[PDB]
Amino acid sequence: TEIRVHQGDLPNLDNYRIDAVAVDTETLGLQPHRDRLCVVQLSSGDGTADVIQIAKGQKSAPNLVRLLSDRDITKIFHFGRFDLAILAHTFGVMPDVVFCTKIASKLTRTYTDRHGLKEICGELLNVNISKQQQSSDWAAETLSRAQIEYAASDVLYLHRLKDIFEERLKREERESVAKACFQFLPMRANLDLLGWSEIDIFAHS
Amino acid sequence: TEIRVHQGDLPNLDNYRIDAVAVDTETLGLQPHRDRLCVVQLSSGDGTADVIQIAKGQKSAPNLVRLLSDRDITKIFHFGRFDLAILAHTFGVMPDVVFCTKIASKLTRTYTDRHGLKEICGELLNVNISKQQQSSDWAAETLSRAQIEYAASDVLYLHRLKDIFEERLKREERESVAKACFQFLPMRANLDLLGWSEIDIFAHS
Amino acid sequence: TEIRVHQGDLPNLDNYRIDAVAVDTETLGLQPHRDRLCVVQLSSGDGTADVIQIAKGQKSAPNLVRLLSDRDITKIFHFGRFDLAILAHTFGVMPDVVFCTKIASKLTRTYTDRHGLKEICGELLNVNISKQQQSSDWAAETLSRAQIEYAASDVLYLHRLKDIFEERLKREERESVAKACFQFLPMRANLDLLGWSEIDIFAHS
Amino acid sequence: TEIRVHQGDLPNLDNYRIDAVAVDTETLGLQPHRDRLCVVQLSSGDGTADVIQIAKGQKSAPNLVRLLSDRDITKIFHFGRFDLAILAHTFGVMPDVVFCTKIASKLTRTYTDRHGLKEICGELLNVNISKQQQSSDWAAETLSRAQIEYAASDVLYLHRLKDIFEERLKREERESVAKACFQFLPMRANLDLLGWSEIDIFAHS
Amino acid sequence: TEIRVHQGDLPNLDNYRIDAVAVDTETLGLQPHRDRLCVVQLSSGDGTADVIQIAKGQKSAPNLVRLLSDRDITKIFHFGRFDLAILAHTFGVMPDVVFCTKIASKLTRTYTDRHGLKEICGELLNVNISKQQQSSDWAAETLSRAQIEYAASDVLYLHRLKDIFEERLKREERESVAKACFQFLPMRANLDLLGWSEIDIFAHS
Amino acid sequence: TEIRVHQGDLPNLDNYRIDAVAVDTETLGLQPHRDRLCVVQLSSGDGTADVIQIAKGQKSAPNLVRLLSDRDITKIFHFGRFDLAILAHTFGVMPDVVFCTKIASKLTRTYTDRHGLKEICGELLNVNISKQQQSSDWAAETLSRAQIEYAASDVLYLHRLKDIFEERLKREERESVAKACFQFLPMRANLDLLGWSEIDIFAHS
Amino acid sequence: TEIRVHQGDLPNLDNYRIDAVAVDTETLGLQPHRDRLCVVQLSSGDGTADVIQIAKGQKSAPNLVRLLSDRDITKIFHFGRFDLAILAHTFGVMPDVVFCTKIASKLTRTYTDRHGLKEICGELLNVNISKQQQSSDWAAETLSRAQIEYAASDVLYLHRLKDIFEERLKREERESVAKACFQFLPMRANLDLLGWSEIDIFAHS
Amino acid sequence: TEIRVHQGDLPNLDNYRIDAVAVDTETLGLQPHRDRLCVVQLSSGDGTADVIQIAKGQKSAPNLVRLLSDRDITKIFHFGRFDLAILAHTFGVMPDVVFCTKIASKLTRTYTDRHGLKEICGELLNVNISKQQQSSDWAAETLSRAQIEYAASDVLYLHRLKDIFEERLKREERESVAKACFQFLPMRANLDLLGWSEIDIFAHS
């Protein structure tokens, strides 16, 4: 649908006077200390998305960061463990009110071992997400139309998933488990930034 | 060392008007749904210990449970993930103010991969704990003297370790990380009881 | 295909005055202590099937359990190790006269290592079994038509397989081996319920 | 200890008018079709043992086979899965009333993963069995004194172990599980002889 | 594409007055002691094949066995290690003049790791072998036409492959290497029959 | 395209008075001591290629070796570790001014784990390389048209890739890292020839 | 032995007007971004050593760094890949004239797979290195005598090993191999610092 | 005992007019193309041995190679697969009358998985071989006395082992199996030299 592309930051928050915002990122790789943040995508759940290109060496994005810091607004991620880490490493603010659809999937879709976003969207919404058959240079000065549409597709459905997962968590009486997991998730991301990314800190060995 | 052996429960809490209590358990195995709790050992950090034999089918232990429920008293474990699970499964109360020396070791003793209690005690206190060369039936009606001495030896040093680990956590500026881990540890134990004991809930796969 | 869908139980056993009944289950997952029984499917071997949706917390299903307890009726399963476990956990009655097509396949189809129901039906009957709905929300209040047809397809062919496998077991002179395996299968399922689900009880290690 | 050595068979059954006999074997290796049975040792549970040297190509041992066939005498083995296989392969008779200390250990000593005979004897009886520091040619025409004493040491304690394991099976309410396992054990051995020795017939894969 | 189907044995050797014969087998599985020989296939190198059904318990096939033991006729196999084993086990005669296309492939097609018959036929002859969609009951009294054609397809091309592989062995100067491997192959099969099927007899460990 | 096929050597260097030449090889396999060099392909980057057939036992190729030795011409490879080894082993000259697109990919395409030439050409240039549908000999006296066109396709695009990778290396400020890696790559190939091909010489173990 | 312990830096370079200096480090762990440098050890090759305690957050050590940047002085390490990384990370200077005894061992001691310092010293010098029986806190304000003597023992023998290894490299004609490996080693360490510490940059996969 | 040390070759064969000679080698490592032959040991089976130091680059040893070529003299090895390879690589002559105690052990000592020379000598002869406490430089100009004695100990007992293994091979009726294995063993070594050292040429994959 409508995808608004920005350089550096949102112009304002007129579209984000809401109770929950869907958030995703794109980077040059899986290691936040080496691989810089290149794109941030946002959606209010109204079927539109904002795509913000982040410049190399950029240290601040005040409007976006105010949104990320607002404790009255839940940030919805799929596998937020990574996005939280890269966002905190880049802008210096660790979000602390979050919902993760992957943790929710692992707590509710107990009849499968496939917890990726594509499988969740397919099963829960009968929506077919098409995943790029190649990767791309997210640090490119000009993003392609295909890149923009792929980047937007990762945030367009997270509100609907959160609603369904919240009903299922209520149904199976696991709400407090999920709440505690989401409360701990930002510290799991911090542990990743500090150097324990390969360690399950709670395991016996 | 003075070891007081009790049947079922502590007679009173006269010996436990303190800020922190060391706690450990002994079971018939690693699976709380199959392997029953057999012994609970406690120490005030003094030179004496209390060893409480738990009967088959015992569902209540009012004095012990008061300690486990008292939010004003920190419960010290080594690998509390297991002990919390078996205690909650046995008595129906999940402690929520805990300190775990194994998590603290993983957060401070970054120069080694051996985090067992014997090795920790050896490095931090130059105390040699001798571990039994065989296992035994902890459900026996009468415990042997060797069993009682081993059970007491498992709690006598956790206070000194906690003091040292708190010094190290302050030194390396990891106090808030440890605090968040300890806050989440009871829910990790509940996740174990509910059926996710073999799953790292935060891993990508 | 005629599929009769019921809530809670069969109305009567008028359609099941027979020597063998095909049985299958659906659940929320592979772990009976966490994942509740959601659907039970039955077939008389005719062109119709019964699909009984089981409610959350349901403890009783007298007509179904009566059928399961009738020692004059052989219960046919594919991989009955699981179905027997979940049935016994849910209703408290362990069937003791059973036939399992997966054990029979391993005892007769020695020229292949693929013993799943789809492959067996393909080889033995030239019948094409489809999929995709296997991983779906079986706890939904209203099952979809696709879910109902997929659930029924799992019982429609077990009688024909039992007939062919009995012929093959006779041909290779392995009938008494199979009979002994079927006699032990309920105890293998009980061992699973008691906590040895990950243990080969007969292995050296 | 008194060890009576015989060639071929017992002279008579005067010492074996008893309710249970301990049985063990020695062979040229683990594969009954290649590696012949070389020695059979028996004990009445007293302080003496019988060691019977079996000749190459020997097809019959009437007194021994009388014991193996007698349904009024329980045959005690440690890991009878192997001994039953080699005995049935050699003499054509499969015992069908058996007790196995390894299954009993796996059903009762749930607090350890070490189920060897040495560990069981050490824990349950505080008896130290010394195992040969070298292997040897059990097919030798004349066994050494060290060989004979080692071979006998494998049967002198099985009665005492069976008595203790019977107490634990009663205490933990697993008597019927053990009984069903013992009934299936001869068929597990037959499955081994027929060619499924590397296959857990009850596993999903 | 003449395929002559026989019961028990060839009627005579009029079509096999030749210097080399292509040979293949079908069985109930990979373990000769458990899985009986069901079919023997022969080819003169022409466009026709002979498919011989072997009965359960059959001990003799004088014309076939005469062919197998005639040292002036080279027997061509693909992976003859197996066929030689099952033939020797069934009829009591081990061929000693053989050619194996798998050894030849491993000695000449060093630029690939895929040495199956389909890949060899595709690369060297541009012949497309179509493999069944599953395995089948080769012990059936009447083989289907599709089964017969597949069985014939396995021998129709071995002469042409032998000719090409001989050219390749001459080109890379490995004729004596291949000859020594072929000389040892019957004894490798004997080791398999005797019980070393899982052992590389030449490996250090 | 125009592909010039030669026997033994280039006729002259009239087409190669240039700053960089794309180089690839084909062999009988991955082991230079066993598997001889069969074809060398070259391109100046003008959309044409030279395909040079190397004879068995050929020790010299004077015009080609002049190109390989000339320090003013950068030799571009994909996974030059192999090509450098086989070229030096065959003609006795190790190139020392090289660029490798695989090392460059590992230093720049950090967002993917697929670094093969097909994936790089597909992703970076939107060019579809169609690879062999089987293997080939390459030792054939006369190469097929399909072989020649496939062989040429491996050098036609390396100049464009080198240009892009050099731009990306500049963007992420990794030029000196790549330069040091390329300086060491010939010595890595030499280490392979001397016998350390299976050893990461820099690993702790 | 004489061991001089310093705080922060060497007092002067009066003892290091030499051609080669032995260098080793101790840290809080294997990950330079998390685990700080705690101790630096130096030796002139005589019977004395210098042990320099490095403070938390220390950015400068001018005399030490003069040694590190003196192109006329070879720095001898055992497994310098790590020490170079941690030194460059801490003080911002990468030594570029180095010798590593582990690379030399892998290039000369080809008859063994054990390349640790204890085994090398044992074989080459008949010197017994005693390894600490526990791990310790190298960040302690005051190191114990056992710690100081252990830390010194790691540098006292590197000169003698370098002499012997140089003889071995000349004898086996691998001098140029070693020189190229040593020249690349600082860049391998830089690659570790940049984020490729887990990647063999030269491997095919 | 008496150990005669020579450089290059035996002075004559006066002590080796015998029907079987024990042979062993020492090298700089496991890869014959990289790691040169350093020592050859010989024994007549009496209480003395000859130890011959081989110089770097030495291409001929006429008396030794005369011994190796003599078809009337059986060469006894332990794991001759390696020694045959290195001998053929060094002197160009492949022995073709051999006996290997390791193959014999694998064909007779079926009751164990431990086939090393030390274990064999311990079991079969009650002879204690003491193995070096480290590795050493076998290319040293002067071998130490301890080195010479260790090297000699590997040949002093092979005759007695051959006699015992031949008795056992007769007893289990595996003489023709062993004979065929020994005939192929030189060709297994040739395959190693040609480049198939890591390939079981007879395996399915």
Side-chain angles (χ1 to χ4, degrees), chain C residues 10-13 15-16 18 20-39:
Chain C
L10 293 173
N12 59 6
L13 295 180
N15 293 114
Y16 291 94
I18 55 180
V21 57
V23 185
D24 186 343
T25 71
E26 304 295 316
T27 67
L28 279 175
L30 297 168
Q31 305 178 16
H33 293 94
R34 179 192 65 192
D35 296 328
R36 74 174 186 83
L37 179 63
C38 295
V39 186

Side-chain angles (χ1 to χ4, degrees), chain F residues 57-58 60-70 72-95 97-112 115-129 132 137-140 142-143 145-148 150-163:
Chain F
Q58 181 179 327
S60 68
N63 287 326
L64 165 65
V65 168
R66 281 171 216 161
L67 208 47
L68 300 178
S69 88
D70 191 335
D72 292 333
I73 303 95
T74 300
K75 272 64 70 171
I76 317 168
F77 306 91
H78 178 83
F79 197 60
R81 178 177 176 172
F82 176 77
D83 302 340
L84 291 166
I86 186 60
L87 288 167
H89 180 64
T90 304
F91 299 124
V93 170
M94 183 69 109
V97 182
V98 309
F99 186 100
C100 176
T101 55
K102 192 158 205 101
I103 290 168
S105 177
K106 290 166 177 265
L107 293 174
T108 57
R109 293 173 68 254
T110 43
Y111 46 79
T112 180
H115 302 284
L117 183 59
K118 184 193 146 273
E119 291 77 3
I120 292 168
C121 284
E123 183 182 1
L124 288 72
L125 310 175
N126 314 305
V127 162
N128 266 17
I129 299 169
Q132 268 183 353
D137 180 16
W138 288 110
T142 301
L143 297 171
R145 182 67 184 172
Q147 280 176 308
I148 292 162
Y150 174 43
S153 79
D154 281 358
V155 291
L156 283 171
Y157 311 109
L158 299 189
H159 285 83
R160 289 159 66 187
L161 294 180
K162 175 173 175 289
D163 290 337

Side-chain angles (χ1 to χ4, degrees), chain E residues 15-16 18 20-43 45-47 49-55 57-58 61-68 70-71 73-95 97-112 114-117 119-127 129 132 137-140 142-143 145-148 150-162 164-165 168-169 171-172 174 176-196:
Chain E
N15 288 318
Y16 290 111
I18 57 187
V21 58
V23 184
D24 188 359
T25 66
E26 308 289 337
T27 65
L28 279 174
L30 296 167
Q31 305 178 18
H33 293 283
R34 180 191 64 193
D35 302 325
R36 74 176 185 85
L37 179 65
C38 293
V39 186
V40 180
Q41 306 138 11
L42 302 170
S43 181
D46 194 351
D50 300 354
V51 172
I52 309 164
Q53 284 186 59
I54 307 297
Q58 181 181 276
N63 286 324
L64 165 67
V65 172
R66 190 187 294 148
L67 200 72
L68 299 179
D70 190 336
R71 318 189 38 200
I73 304 180
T74 299
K75 271 63 70 171
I76 316 168
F77 306 91
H78 177 83
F79 198 59
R81 178 174 177 173
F82 175 78
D83 300 287
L84 291 167
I86 185 59
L87 288 167
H89 181 65
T90 303
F91 299 123
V93 172
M94 171 64 85
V97 183
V98 308
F99 186 97
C100 177
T101 80
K102 186 63 66 68
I103 291 169
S105 179
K106 290 165 164 269
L107 294 174
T108 57
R109 292 173 67 253
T110 43
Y111 45 79
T112 180
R114 295 178 65 88
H115 301 283
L117 183 57
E119 292 112 326
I120 292 170
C121 283
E123 180 202 314
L124 295 71
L125 312 175
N126 307 291
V127 161
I129 301 294
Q132 299 287 107
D137 187 25
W138 288 108
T142 300
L143 297 170
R145 183 53 166 84
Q147 221 175 358
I148 292 164
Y150 170 87
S153 77
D154 279 337
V155 291
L156 282 171
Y157 310 106
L158 299 189
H159 283 83
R160 288 159 66 187
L161 295 178
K162 176 172 174 289
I164 294 168
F165 281 126
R168 306 290 270 268
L169 289 165
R171 187 182 71 187
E172 320 269 5
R174 292 169 194 155
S176 70
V177 176
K179 178 182 176 260
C181 293
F182 301 149
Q183 183 62 255
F184 184 72
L185 187 55
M187 185 61 74
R188 181 62 266 194
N190 264 323
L191 274 79
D192 291 13
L193 292 175
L194 296 174
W196 282 267

Side-chain angles (χ1 to χ4, degrees), chain B residues 18 20-34:
Chain B
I18 55 188
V21 57
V23 183
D24 182 9
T25 67
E26 295 302 320
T27 67
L28 278 176
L30 297 169
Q31 305 178 18
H33 294 287
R34 180 191 65 192

